[PDB]
Structures are given as structure tokens and as C-alpha cells.
Amino acid sequence: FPRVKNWEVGSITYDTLSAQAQQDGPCTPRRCLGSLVFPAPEQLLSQARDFINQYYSSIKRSGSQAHEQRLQEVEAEVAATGTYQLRESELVFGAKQAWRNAPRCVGRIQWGKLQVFDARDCRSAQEMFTYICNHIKYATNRGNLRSAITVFPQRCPGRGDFRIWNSQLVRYAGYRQQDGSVRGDPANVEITELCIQHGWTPGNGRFDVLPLLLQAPDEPPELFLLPPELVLEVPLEHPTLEWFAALGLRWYALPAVSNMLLEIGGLEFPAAPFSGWYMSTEIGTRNLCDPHRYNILEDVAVCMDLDTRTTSSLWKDKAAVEINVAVLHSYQLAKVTIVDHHAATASFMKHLENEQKARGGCPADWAWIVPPISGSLTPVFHQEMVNYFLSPAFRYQPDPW
Amino acid sequence: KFPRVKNWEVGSITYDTLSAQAQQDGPCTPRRCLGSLVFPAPEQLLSQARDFINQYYSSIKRSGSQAHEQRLQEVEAEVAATGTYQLRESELVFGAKQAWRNAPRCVGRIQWGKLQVFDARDCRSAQEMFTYICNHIKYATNRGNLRSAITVFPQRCPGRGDFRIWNSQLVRYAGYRQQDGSVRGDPANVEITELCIQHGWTPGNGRFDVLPLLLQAPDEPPELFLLPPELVLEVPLEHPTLEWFAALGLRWYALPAVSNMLLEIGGLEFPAAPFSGWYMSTEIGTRNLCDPHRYNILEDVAVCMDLDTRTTSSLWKDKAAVEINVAVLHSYQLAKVTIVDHHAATASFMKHLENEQKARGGCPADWAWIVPPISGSLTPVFHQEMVNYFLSPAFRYQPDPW
Ligand code: HEM
Ligand code: HEM
Ligand SMILES: C[C@H](O)[C@H](O)[C@H]1CNc2nc(N)[nH]c(=O)c2N1
Ligand SMILES: C[C@H](O)[C@H](O)[C@H]1CNc2nc(N)[nH]c(=O)c2N1
Ligand SMILES: NC(=[NH2+])NCCC[C@H](N)C(=O)O
Ligand SMILES: NC(=[NH2+])NCCC[C@H](N)C(=O)O
Ligand SMILES: [Gd]
Ligand SMILES: [Gd]
Ligand SMILES: [Zn+2]
Structure with a gap:
């Protein structure tokens, strides 16, 4: 187990949680790639069992009748259908765990406080829009922001994915100029051009809110305008x-990040936008x-x-x-x-302390946790961190085009 | 096959092919990254010596020459006969500059080719170590027009203890622990301060008292030396x-002037080799x-x-x-x-990365150390992906000699 030191205080911990790391990262004994931004029924059942065990452990019911019953239920579903469905309580647990497990998030002290909207019964891009508007309304709450995630139907064989094409629910357009420069936000030139391709009449301001491009399974994406009264x-x-x-x-x-994939117990949710403040x-x-x-x-x-x-x-x-x-x-x-x-960094230090007692460690990506100004004036700069992948998780995924 | 590395400000992408030549293991594994951690025979000596001699002859564009072959044979013969070997003066200079060039935590490496190398491999006592150190300080300080320098003391050899400089830098301020637990002066230097006192130093009581040197000659206890105040600018x-x-x-x-790191060149180890820049x-x-x-x-x-x-x-x-x-x-x-x-400094480091991509196909760099501790993303290095790996010649951490 890696020995981890805080240089401001001189305190030492051991990250025993890292021993449980599911998937492999990009580093090897020969070279570290920590600073890079983007480096079967049997396997699914293995992940599903791991997840169910994890959940039942968390609620202090490991090896209970309810635990064994749930395991049997999952085994039967997969055997019959090739997949399985989460109970609502498991979805909520899984979403909070994925946030908890996110190494690049400095805001994780809040992980236990998350509103989870179940949109797994969604059928159309039109209904996707309604769910998204409700999410925005709730999360914004007139300026008193509340953390929330909306979960759209999981990926399944023989059906296309639900996808939100936008990288966030609210983004400013970026317009390419004749000279090659950009008016507005350069990060969003690609999505801006796709919106225009799919029929959007562009503005020409520096802060034009983009429409949403929503993809229902096996359909081309559909364009939706956000009502300005919704976008604070x-x-x-x-x-x-x-x-x-x-x-x-x-x-x-x-x-409101909208392009990441939520993985829970081997199930994958390619559309699950989440927001905090x-x-x-x-x-x-x-x-x-x-x-x-x-x-x-x-x-x-x-x-x-x-x-x-x-x-x-x-x-x-x-x-x-x-x-x-x-x-x-x-x-x-x-x-x-x-x-x-x-x-934020002071609260994260508190989070590290909570997680050391709770789980024996906390995956964290130092380069992302340390703020982009005044780094060493924050306590996290002086804290050694161990980065590894745990599931449930939020993962990057390819753009749907 | 090689790590793909992006700069996010510019969108440019390179492949670090140099990383494939990494000569020692770092602390990371595919299961977890430890990149943020501060402090994570004849056949092997011969492999390291041959690799180094090859680097040297390539550096001067004489690979394959009769001189190249003669040196390889000589080194192999010397190792066979004596268990070790001696660097030629020109190889020492090249080796010290390469170790600087290879140092992943140094942002000042644009300067790597300009280094004054003092050969102190003839040093015989702590008194003589002090003479060399005083001359280093005088040369490097140059009345404020600083010049980068390294002084290389004799290498580690069997049957003989090491030369060591106990101090972590040649110039450091004393840290005096007070009764209540607080520190007067520099808290980083409490331990070396207490050792100086243990070894006969009469302490001051200020916040900026320059520490004496504790210098250790082979198989001797360390000896205390005071730096002439006129020498310390x-x-x-x-x-x-x-x-x-x-x-x-x-x-x-x-x-x-960092004085507690070990310089490694061609399998040879120099436990005392203080270096300074600005x-x-x-x-x-x-x-x-x-x-x-x-x-x-x-x-x-x-x-x-x-x-x-x-x-x-x-x-x-x-x-x-x-x-x-x-x-x-x-x-x-x-x-x-x-x-x-x-x-x-960070702008010059970006130029260095560019030079090194062309010269060697990559550059080992430790992102957490290269990005400055204030205004990180206002500097170009924040937006530059980096690959961290160990090449030799190298500067390495070593245990404290007490
Ligand atoms: C509640 C207040 C929150 C704060 C203050 C906060 C803070 C942050 C910050 C500063 C980042 C770095 C983002 C960047 O540099 O682009 C981040 C990343 C991240 N956050 Fe949090 N966050 C919060 C809520 C949430 C919630 C509710 C979730 C999920 C349920 C979440 C999951 C993530 C993930 C997955 C990343 C990585 C994004 C990426 O890789 O681009 N965060 N957070
Ligand atoms: C010429 C001007 C130089 C500048 C501006 C410079 C800059 C730096 C900086 C800012 C650091 C980080 C130090 C820390 O945070 O404690 C560093 C580390 C380092 N530098 Fe340079 N440096 C210079 C010269 C040199 C020279 C001459 C050498 C060796 C011949 C060298 C080798 C190293 C090494 C080995 C480290 C790692 C130190 C450690 O791990 O504690 N540097 N340098
Ligand atoms: C190259 C480097 O990894 C990249 O610029 C990272 C550095 N740290 C970061 N940290 C945060 N929070 N967000 C980021 O986008 C980045 N960018
Ligand atoms: C824990 C963390 O690695 C530690 O505080 C590092 C971070 N980056 C650094 N970077 C430099 N240049 N010097 C340092 O001492 C440190 N300290
Ligand atoms: N605090 C958060 N939840 N951030 C999510 C990422 C937002 C992104 N950094 C932005 O500037 O829009
Ligand atoms: N620029 C350098 N060469 N630095 C070497 C390390 C010096 C150390 N950071 C100090 O504050 O004393
Ligand atoms: Gd003015
Ligand atoms: Gd003033
Ligand atoms: Zn790593």
C-alpha cells in the first residue's frame, strides 16, 4: 500500500483503497503519464456482482437474505435478457458513488448530497428535452444551486444510444471568422458548427447560448432551443x-456536464448529465x-x-x-x-480525511485538484495523492459524430 | 507504441520516443499513479558504462571512431581488473551536463549546455572540500552576475567511505526550535541546525542566520566550517x-546551491557534487x-x-x-x-521542450514540479502534457548520512 504524506503538517497515511482498483491507468514503471488529459454475460455478471456486493456492504446488509435474493435476481435477468435493470435505490447509490470516485473533482465533500432524476423510461428527444429542462430548473433553483444528475436509458444491444451532443447543457457559441480567429468561445466551435448544420440560425455575439442537440436511439439529433428564462x-x-x-x-x-458516460455495475449510461455549482x-x-x-x-x-x-x-x-x-x-x-x-480546497482536505476513515483512501488527480492560480497557497498543493480507477464511475466517451 | 503528447494552448501533438529508453523504474503502475509523490555488479556496471560511453561519442559526432572503440575496450578492461573505472575529464563535463539535461524536476534546463564543471576528484580531506566549496561559491556568485556551476568530489569506491556534504544546500538559514514548538528562522532546516549545534556550533538567535557547513571526508566524522560572510551574497x-x-x-x-543529491554517470556514483544556478x-x-x-x-x-x-x-x-x-x-x-x-522561465522551458523534441525525440518532465506554485495556468507549461521518466546520467536523491 502506497505511503502518502502531507508536507504542510507532516502527517502520513496509507492508501489501502488503491489495492481495489478496477481498471488500469496509463502509467507504467517505465514512464508516468499522469499529466495527460485523455490517455459477454460473464464479464457483465462479474461487474454486477461486485456492484451489488458493494451496495449491500454500504447499507450493512452483506450476506443478508435481501443481498442473496438480489444477486439471484440479477443472475436470472442477465441469463434471460443478456442484461439487467437497477432498482431505483441502486441507481441513486451508483450515481453518488461515481461522483465519490471521480479523481478530478475537487467538490467531492458534497458527494452524499445529490438529486438523482430517473429518466430511464425516456423514449423521444422531445421527452429528453423535457427532462433536461426540469433538471435545469431544479438545479438552478433561482441561484440557490442544488447538485443533480438526470439518468437516461442505459445502452443496450441492437439499439442506438441516447446522447446529448453538447459538452454541457449551457455553453456559449464560438463562431469562426474569415481570418481564422473566433468570436465567442473557441472551445465550442465544433458544436456550434454542428448546430448550424442541423438548422440553427446562429447569432453573432460573444455570449450566445447554444441550442441543444439531442439524439434519441437510431435517429439523427434534434435541435432544441433553451427558453432564456431557464438559463440564469x-x-x-x-x-x-x-x-x-x-x-x-x-x-x-x-x-452541467453532458458528454460523459456513467458506468454502474457493468451497465452504461451514455447520457447522464450532472451539475453542481x-x-x-x-x-x-x-x-x-x-x-x-x-x-x-x-x-x-x-x-x-x-x-x-x-x-x-x-x-x-x-x-x-x-x-x-x-x-x-x-x-x-x-x-x-x-x-x-x-x-473548495479546504473542504477537499476534509473530504480526504473522511474518506481515509471510511474507505482507507481516495483516488485523486493532483494536477486537476490543485487550482490554476495560487496553487501552493492552497492545502492540496502540499498533499500527496494516489490516482486510480474505481467503479461506479464517470468516463470520457467518443463524440457521437 | 510511444506516448502521444498534446499541447492544449496550441493543439500541437508530439510522440515521446525518448521515453522508450528509460533506464530505471519509476513508482507508477497501471493500477495506480504515484506521480505526485515527492520521495517515492560488474555486468551491470559495464552495461551502464558502455551506454554512457556511447552517449559521449555520439555527442561529439565520433560514433564508431577508433577513439570510441578504444575507450570501450579500456573501460571493460579497467572494470575487469579493478572493479571500477575512472572518467576522462571531458566525459565528466559531458556527464554533468547530461544529468542536468535529464532532470525532470528542473524548469531551467534551457541552460543545460552552459555549466562550469569543477573537477574535485583529487580532494583528500574535509578542509580541502571546504576550499573547493568556497571557490565554487565565489565563482558562481560572481558579484551577482550568477553563473551555473557544479563541483564534483571523488566517486564512491569500495574500501573507503563517501565524501558527503551534510547540508541540503551550501547556503541555508538556521531554524531554531523554541520551547512552545514554534520555530525562529527557517523550519525546513531545524534538523541540520540541531546537528550543527551537536557538532560544536554556537548558534545565533536570528531569523536569517547562515548555517555553517558540516563536511564529511571518508571514514571521518563530519567537520564544521563557517562561511566567510563576505562570501555569502x-x-x-x-x-x-x-x-x-x-x-x-x-x-x-x-x-x-543544492548539495545533498547524488550525481550518477555511467554507473559511477558521486555522493558529493553540489550544483548551483540562479x-x-x-x-x-x-x-x-x-x-x-x-x-x-x-x-x-x-x-x-x-x-x-x-x-x-x-x-x-x-x-x-x-x-x-x-x-x-x-x-x-x-x-x-x-x-x-x-x-x-516557463516560456524558456517550452523552447527547451521544442529543442529536445528535435534533438532526442522527447524530454522527461515532472508536470507537478514544472508548473509554478502561483499562476499555474497563466504559464504555457500548465497546458503542456508531459511524460516523466528516468534517464542516466542523473541527479538522484540519497539518504541523509546521519
Ligand atoms: C457541488 C459542487 C461541485 C464543485 C464545486 C465541483 C468542482 C469541480 C471542479 C473545479 C472540477 C474541475 C473541472 C474542470 O477543470 O473542467 C470538477 C470536475 C469533475 N466533477 Fe465536480 N464539482 C461539483 C459537483 C459535481 C457533481 C454533482 C458531479 C457528479 C455527480 C461531479 C463530477 C465531476 C467529474 C466527473 C469531473 C471531471 C470532469 C472532467 O474530467 O472533465 N462534480 N468538479
Ligand atoms: C540556471 C538557472 C536554473 C534555474 C532557473 C533552475 C530552476 C529550477 C527550479 C525552479 C527547480 C524547482 C526547485 C524546487 O522547487 O525546490 C529546479 C530543480 C532542480 N534543478 Fe534546476 N535551475 C537552474 C539550474 C540548475 C543547475 C545548474 C542544475 C544542475 C547542474 C539544476 C538541476 C536541478 C535538479 C537536479 C532539480 C531537482 C531538485 C529537487 O528535486 O529537489 N538546475 N530547478
Ligand atoms: C496538460 C494538463 O494535464 C492540462 O492542462 C490540465 C492540467 N490541470 C487541469 N486541472 C483542471 N481542474 N482542469 C483542467 O482542464 C486541467 N488541465
Ligand atoms: C505533494 C506535492 O508533490 C508537493 O507539494 C510538490 C508539488 N510540486 C512542487 N514543485 C516544485 N517545483 N517544488 C516542490 O517542492 C513541489 N512540491
Ligand atoms: N464545478 C463543476 N461542477 N464543474 C464542471 C466543469 C465545468 C467547466 N470547468 C466549466 O468551466 O464550465
Ligand atoms: N533555481 C534553483 N537552482 N533551485 C534549486 C532549489 C532551491 C530551493 N527551491 C530554494 O528555494 O532554496
Ligand atoms: Gd486611462
Ligand atoms: Gd505606497
Ligand atoms: Zn503516474
Whole structure:
């Protein structure tokens, strides 16, 4: 078992949970690839039994009659149908475990608090839209954000998957210009072009909310416009720099990831969008300041009258901090849930402590957990971490086109 | 067959073919990644020596020459007769530069080809170690126009103990543990401070007392040596617009000189081989001054700046850290002591990655160490995928000699 040290406090733990790691990662004794973003009835039954055992253990009913009965039920379904169906309680447990097991999520202190919408009876893209709107309404809750996941029907043989083509439920369009530059969000140029291909009349703003492209099994994707009253946005202002508001920057309240696959007990849900609330560096540092995103850092530095002709003035650092201040100030002013990187990382340290007692460890991806500004000012920078794959899980999956 | 590596800022993709030549195992397995952990015979010696001699002759474009073959034969014969072998001076220089080039945790490797190598393999005593160390410091400091240097003491050999420098760096500030558990000075150096005291050093009582050297010659107890204060260049810290900052009485030293790592070249081990370059400002301004377990000055600075330290969302920590880093850069520049900011350094490292892709087909790099401890994603290295692996010649950690 790996020995894991916190360098701020000098405390030591052993991650015994890593010994249970299901699937293999990208590293070998010869080289580490930890910094890379994207590195049969019999097998299904094996995963299903592992999951059922896990669940019954969690509710303190291992080797109970109910446990053995459930195992028999699953064996019978698979033998008859080649697959099986989760009880609603198992779906809820599985979704929370997948969040709990996500090594790249710093917000996992909240894992036990998740609203799970069962959309496994969904039949049409039209109904997919209704479920998505209800999710957004619930999760947004007028700015008092609540964590939620909506689970669409599982993958099955001889039927296409349900898919949400958009990477998130709310995203800003990115429009390619004649010179090769982008107006709007460069991260979304591909999905923007697909929306246009499927009949969407594009705007030409910097913050146009994208329509949804929803795919019901074996159908071409269908285009749906989100009602603007459903999409809560926050205009950005700064508490002391009066000109900041004039920049016309804004962002949306609800981070709702919609392109990942949920795996539970060998079953796969290719459409299962989930949402929480934002950590401020996601917006202020990554979305607005990344050179391949909105890339506004230098615009802000010009407005602050910073010396941008020498790196050693640390103009980039100063401009970035004020942008993060503006995000935090603006979300709080607008009464929309947001957490700063210091509070989030402190809660994650608490989570690590909880998980050490509960499970003997916690899979975590250091490069993703440490915030993109002020890294070593947060306690997570000083914490050694072990990264491994546990199931239930959220997995990346190929784009449906 | 080879790891595919993407840069996310630019969208460019390369394959790290050099990784396939990795010479030792790291700590990761397909089951779990330990990349974030800080500290995770004749036939073998001959294989390592032949590989190194081959690297050398390739480096000078004389692969296959009569000189190349003669050296291979000579080394194999020497190992057979003596159990070990000796490097030629030119091989030592090449080997030290390669070890720097190979160091996955160093962001300053654009400079790898410019290294002054002092050959101290003739050293016979701790007194003589001290002479070599003093000369290294004087040369490398160069009145503030810093020059990268390494001094190589005699290699490990059977029948004889090692030369060792007990100190973790040539210049370090004492850390004096107080009764209540607190530390006056640098908490990172409490152990070496206590050992100096155990070995006859009369301690000071300041926050910035330069430690003496504990130098160990083979099969001898360590001996204590005081550095002439005129030899240790220091920089008082002030801030260009926060006038009270100077009154904190902070200072740092010019020369970062790591002295506790082992240099490995062609199977030969040099347990004493201190090296020095120049500082990147975040090492001082962010880590040394702001780590909670180091000087820990962040809150006091923030309060003097009149920041709201009552809630985290004002980002008082971030604002104060940036100004401390500004003070470090301003002060070193004012004192005319070489220093590099994290933006300039990471940009130069990206150039180094490019050079190395063409030259060797890859570059071993430890992402967690390369990305600076403030403003990570504002630097290009944050967006660059990296492959971490071990090549030799190398600088390696080694157990403390006590
Ligand atoms: C409740 C407040 C939450 C906070 C503050 C939070 C925070 C974060 C942050 C900062 C990231 C890094 C994202 C990035 O850099 O792109 C992340 C990733 C992630 N989160 Fe959480 N999160 C929350 C809720 C959730 C929920 C409800 C789920 C699932 C049920 C979840 C699952 C994940 C997954 C799978 C990732 C990895 C995404 C990827 O690989 O691109 N998170 N989270
Ligand atoms: C010339 C200017 C140089 C700069 C700007 C530079 C920069 C850095 C930085 C910022 C680190 C991280 C240190 C830490 O966080 O503790 C580092 C580590 C390292 N550097 Fe360089 N360096 C320079 C010269 C050198 C030289 C001359 C050598 C050897 C000949 C070297 C070899 C190493 C090694 C082996 C490490 C790893 C240290 C450890 O693991 O504790 N560097 N360097
Ligand atoms: C190359 C590197 O792995 C990549 O830039 C990562 C670094 N850490 C990250 N961390 C988070 N939270 N989100 C990210 O998108 C990234 N990007
Ligand atoms: C636990 C973690 O590996 C540790 O804090 C590392 C992170 N990255 C680092 N990076 C550098 N350059 N120097 C360090 O000391 C560290 N410390
Ligand atoms: N806090 C979250 N749940 N984040 C999910 C990822 C959101 C993504 N980083 C974004 O900036 O939109
Ligand atoms: N730039 C260097 N060569 N650094 C070597 C390590 C110095 C160490 N980080 C310090 O703060 O003293
Ligand atoms: Gd102006
Ligand atoms: Gd002032
Ligand atoms: Zn790894």
C-alpha cells in the first residue's frame, strides 16, 4: 500500500483503497503519464456482482437474505435478457458513488448530497428535452444551486444510444471568422458548427447560448432551443474597478456536464448529465483567461494600466486575480452559489480525511485538484495523492459524430 | 507504441520516443499513479558504462571512431581488473551536463549546455572540500552576475567511505526550535541546525542566520566550517510601492546551491557534487516565504496591506502572495543579482521542450514540479502534457548520512 504524506503538517497515511482498483491507468514503471488529459454475460455478471456486493456492504446488509435474493435476481435477468435493470435505490447509490470516485473533482465533500432524476423510461428527444429542462430548473433553483444528475436509458444491444451532443447543457457559441480567429468561445466551435448544420440560425455575439442537440436511439439529433428564462446568467462587475462592468463579460450559473458516460455495475449510461455549482477559478482563470478560450487577460491588464512590456512586473498575475475577484463578487451580488478556490480546497482536505476513515483512501488527480492560480497557497498543493480507477464511475466517451 | 503528447494552448501533438529508453523504474503502475509523490555488479556496471560511453561519442559526432572503440575496450578492461573505472575529464563535463539535461524536476534546463564543471576528484580531506566549496561559491556568485556551476568530489569506491556534504544546500538559514514548538528562522532546516549545534556550533538567535557547513571526508566524522560572510551574497527585501515591507526585515541569499543529491554517470556514483544556478522568483517569494511550514509571512503582509482577511473570497491570500513575489523580483533586480520570473522561465522551458523534441525525440518532465506554485495556468507549461521518466546520467536523491 502506497505511503502518502502531507508536507504542510507532516502527517502520513496509507492508501489501502488503491489495492481495489478496477481498471488500469496509463502509467507504467517505465514512464508516468499522469499529466495527460485523455490517455459477454460473464464479464457483465462479474461487474454486477461486485456492484451489488458493494451496495449491500454500504447499507450493512452483506450476506443478508435481501443481498442473496438480489444477486439471484440479477443472475436470472442477465441469463434471460443478456442484461439487467437497477432498482431505483441502486441507481441513486451508483450515481453518488461515481461522483465519490471521480479523481478530478475537487467538490467531492458534497458527494452524499445529490438529486438523482430517473429518466430511464425516456423514449423521444422531445421527452429528453423535457427532462433536461426540469433538471435545469431544479438545479438552478433561482441561484440557490442544488447538485443533480438526470439518468437516461442505459445502452443496450441492437439499439442506438441516447446522447446529448453538447459538452454541457449551457455553453456559449464560438463562431469562426474569415481570418481564422473566433468570436465567442473557441472551445465550442465544433458544436456550434454542428448546430448550424442541423438548422440553427446562429447569432453573432460573444455570449450566445447554444441550442441543444439531442439524439434519441437510431435517429439523427434534434435541435432544441433553451427558453432564456431557464438559463440564469451573471453579468460580471468588479467591486472597485468601475470600468469592469462595461467590458460586458458574463457567465452562466449552472455547470452541467453532458458528454460523459456513467458506468454502474457493468451497465452504461451514455447520457447522464450532472451539475453542481462553479468553483470561481473555472470561470475567472480558465474560461476567461486561457489563451485558447476567451483570452481576455491582456485586455484587462490594459484597463488596469499595468506595465505589459516586462513579465517581471507580474501584470498577468495581477490581472488574473482581479478577474477572479470580479467573478466571486458578481456571483455573490447576483445571489448565485459559487465557491472560491481556497474554500473548495479546504473542504477537499476534509473530504480526504473522511474518506481515509471510511474507505482507507481516495483516488485523486493532483494536477486537476490543485487550482490554476495560487496553487501552493492552497492545502492540496502540499498533499500527496494516489490516482486510480474505481467503479461506479464517470468516463470520457467518443463524440457521437 | 510511444506516448502521444498534446499541447492544449496550441493543439500541437508530439510522440515521446525518448521515453522508450528509460533506464530505471519509476513508482507508477497501471493500477495506480504515484506521480505526485515527492520521495517515492560488474555486468551491470559495464552495461551502464558502455551506454554512457556511447552517449559521449555520439555527442561529439565520433560514433564508431577508433577513439570510441578504444575507450570501450579500456573501460571493460579497467572494470575487469579493478572493479571500477575512472572518467576522462571531458566525459565528466559531458556527464554533468547530461544529468542536468535529464532532470525532470528542473524548469531551467534551457541552460543545460552552459555549466562550469569543477573537477574535485583529487580532494583528500574535509578542509580541502571546504576550499573547493568556497571557490565554487565565489565563482558562481560572481558579484551577482550568477553563473551555473557544479563541483564534483571523488566517486564512491569500495574500501573507503563517501565524501558527503551534510547540508541540503551550501547556503541555508538556521531554524531554531523554541520551547512552545514554534520555530525562529527557517523550519525546513531545524534538523541540520540541531546537528550543527551537536557538532560544536554556537548558534545565533536570528531569523536569517547562515548555517555553517558540516563536511564529511571518508571514514571521518563530519567537520564544521563557517562561511566567510563576505562570501555569502544576500538581498534585503523591499517592495517598490509598499514602503513598510522593508521594515519586515526579510532577506534571502543570492545562490541556490543544492548539495545533498547524488550525481550518477555511467554507473559511477558521486555522493558529493553540489550544483548551483540562479533563482526563479517563486521559489523564494511563494514557497520559502509563504509556505505555512516555512517563513509563513502571508497573513502579516496581507494585514499590513489592509486586506480583508476575514473571508477567503476577497482573495487576500492571492493578492498578498503576488505582492511578495513582486518584492522578490524588485529586490534582486535592485541588488543586481540574477533572478528569473516564472513567466520567463516557463516560456524558456517550452523552447527547451521544442529543442529536445528535435534533438532526442522527447524530454522527461515532472508536470507537478514544472508548473509554478502561483499562476499555474497563466504559464504555457500548465497546458503542456508531459511524460516523466528516468534517464542516466542523473541527479538522484540519497539518504541523509546521519
Ligand atoms: C457541488 C459542487 C461541485 C464543485 C464545486 C465541483 C468542482 C469541480 C471542479 C473545479 C472540477 C474541475 C473541472 C474542470 O477543470 O473542467 C470538477 C470536475 C469533475 N466533477 Fe465536480 N464539482 C461539483 C459537483 C459535481 C457533481 C454533482 C458531479 C457528479 C455527480 C461531479 C463530477 C465531476 C467529474 C466527473 C469531473 C471531471 C470532469 C472532467 O474530467 O472533465 N462534480 N468538479
Ligand atoms: C540556471 C538557472 C536554473 C534555474 C532557473 C533552475 C530552476 C529550477 C527550479 C525552479 C527547480 C524547482 C526547485 C524546487 O522547487 O525546490 C529546479 C530543480 C532542480 N534543478 Fe534546476 N535551475 C537552474 C539550474 C540548475 C543547475 C545548474 C542544475 C544542475 C547542474 C539544476 C538541476 C536541478 C535538479 C537536479 C532539480 C531537482 C531538485 C529537487 O528535486 O529537489 N538546475 N530547478
Ligand atoms: C496538460 C494538463 O494535464 C492540462 O492542462 C490540465 C492540467 N490541470 C487541469 N486541472 C483542471 N481542474 N482542469 C483542467 O482542464 C486541467 N488541465
Ligand atoms: C505533494 C506535492 O508533490 C508537493 O507539494 C510538490 C508539488 N510540486 C512542487 N514543485 C516544485 N517545483 N517544488 C516542490 O517542492 C513541489 N512540491
Ligand atoms: N464545478 C463543476 N461542477 N464543474 C464542471 C466543469 C465545468 C467547466 N470547468 C466549466 O468551466 O464550465
Ligand atoms: N533555481 C534553483 N537552482 N533551485 C534549486 C532549489 C532551491 C530551493 N527551491 C530554494 O528555494 O532554496
Ligand atoms: Gd486611462
Ligand atoms: Gd505606497
Ligand atoms: Zn503516474
